[PDB]
Amino acid sequence: GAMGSMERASLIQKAKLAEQAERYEDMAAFMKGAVEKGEELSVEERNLLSVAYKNVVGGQRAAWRVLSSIEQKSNEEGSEEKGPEVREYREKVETELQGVCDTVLGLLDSHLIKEAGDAESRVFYLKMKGDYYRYLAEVATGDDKKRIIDSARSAYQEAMDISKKEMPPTHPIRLGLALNFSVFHYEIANSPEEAISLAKTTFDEAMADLHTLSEDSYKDSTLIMQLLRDNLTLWT
């Protein structure tokens, strides 16, 4: 792409500089260039790729929700007609967000997932695939919506099945996967009971394994466990 001429190491070094400068669109472009070099990603590199895109897409999602709320209000009885501009601009933001999701899903399909053999890489990428189909599902209203939801479910389920077999119940990737799959159940699949059961069981199985951990691993795991508790508190 436009990053075709830059060394892989220089793309990684610039992604880290962009992160320090809070320039997340640049960070994501540098990391997309690094992926497109064709080599597998190390754990540090996979987390640079995730950090970059989650911040880009998170700006688009928060903007989309502001716009959608405005558009819904314009559709209430007694609202003055203001023309097509709110729908057009929500659509503009929606299309760009879909495009970011398609770009991430494209990197995973070409060819991050197929070369990822170890559990920590394979589960991380499948969680990513679930997360970006979930962001597509958040905006979907069409004939497509069930299949987008199903794609998110299927990716999360394959990541859950590997993580349960190959990772300890305290592993931060296994914990974050379960936190996000639980959010998928609650907010996307209309299954709040499955969301609460998943968050509860995940929290309790990690609590029972904390004893095996070093002080630093303990802090990594308990951080994610508190997110699961925050959602159980919100939902119960």
Partner: peptide
Amino acid sequence: KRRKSV
């Protein structure tokens, strides 16, 4: 106030 994801 918003549910957590990571």
